């Protein structure tokens, strides 16, 4: 996918903002890269909300290995186009720039597609209430003296 590392995400965001890329004559100083990757880590930890929020393949740096910019991320190929777009939208306040409306629309689309699958998977129907008889048509649960449903428990 050529965007394997977190630094690739940061560089893609910077290129999308137009601040710096491979074909540019001025570049960004590494401390700004460190700040941007820290901001990316903070943003990605607010979408996860500890397993209760947007769930995507992502591994957080354990801080034992010094450079968190170099290590891999577990993002699937589909979520990359959303993560770095949102990162670029968040970075622009750091500089004097403002994100173009196209980037905002792309970030919206990316987050919606990120959460749609989990929304489908999490729409489950609750069991029958505690005080609900099972009718005389089951003929087996009725003969096993288990007339009423167990409950949500």
């Amino acid at each position: 996918m050529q965007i394997k590392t977190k630094g690739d995400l940061v560089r893609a965001a910077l290129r999308k903002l137009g601040v710096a890329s491979d074909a540019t004559l001025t570049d960004v100083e590494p401390q700004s890269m460190q700040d941007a990757v820290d901001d990316l880590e903070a943003m990605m930890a607010e979408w996860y909300q500890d397993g209760k929020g947007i769930i995507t393949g992502y591994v957080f740096s354990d801080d034992e290995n010094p450079p968190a910019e170099g290590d891999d991320h577990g993002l699937r190929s589909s979520a990359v186009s959303a993560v770095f777009h949102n990162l670029a939208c968040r970075i622009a306040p750091d500089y004097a720039l403002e994100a173009t409306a196209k980037i905002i629309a792309t970030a919206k689309y990316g987050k919606e597609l990120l959460y749609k699958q989990t929304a489908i998977s999490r729409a489950k129907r609750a069991p029958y209430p505690s005080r609900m008889p099972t009718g005389s048509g089951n003929s087996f649960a009725n003969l096993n003296e288990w007339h009423y449903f167990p409950g949500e428990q």
Partner: protein
Amino acid sequence: NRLESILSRFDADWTASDEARREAKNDLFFSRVSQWDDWLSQYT
């Protein structure tokens, strides 16, 4: 020989009146035991 003739006659009589027997048995089960004739393909 005799047993063969008896069994042939019985088989003819049994096969000649299958639909009526099946429908009567279904009626008896529906009227006496239960009204949900879904013993097959149940428990899913």
